[PDB]
């Protein structure tokens, strides 16, 4: 129960990291004029 709460807190940090990095990648790629 409590262990799962702490684990999910760690997992959420990981998910947010991934989402932010993906957003940055997409943004940078979208900057290149066509
Ligand atoms: Na963008």
Residue numbers in the entry: 1 to 34
What did the article's authors report about this structure?
LL-37 is an extensively studied peptide with particular relevance in human innate immunity. LL-37 is produced as a precursor protein in human cells (e.g. leukocytes or neutrophils) and processed during its secretion to the skin, lungs, or reproductive tract. The active peptide carries a surplus of positive charge, which is attributed to interactions with the LPS or LTA of the bacterial cell wall, and negatively charged lipids of in vivo cytoplasmic membranes. We determined its atomic structure in solution and the putative membrane interaction states. Together the structures in the absence and presence of detergents revealed discrete detergent binding sites at the dimer interface indicating the presence of in vivo lipid binding sites.
Our first crystals yielded a monomeric structure at atomic resolution (termed LL-37DPC-1) obtained under conditions comprising artificially high MPD concentrations (70% MPD). The second structure (termed LL-372) obtained in the absence of detergents displays an anti-parallel dimer formed by two α-helices without supercoiling. Intramolecular stabilization of the monomer is provided by backbone H-bonds and salt bridges (formed between Asp4 and Arg7, Glu16 and Arg19 and Asp26 and Arg29, Gln22 and Asp26).
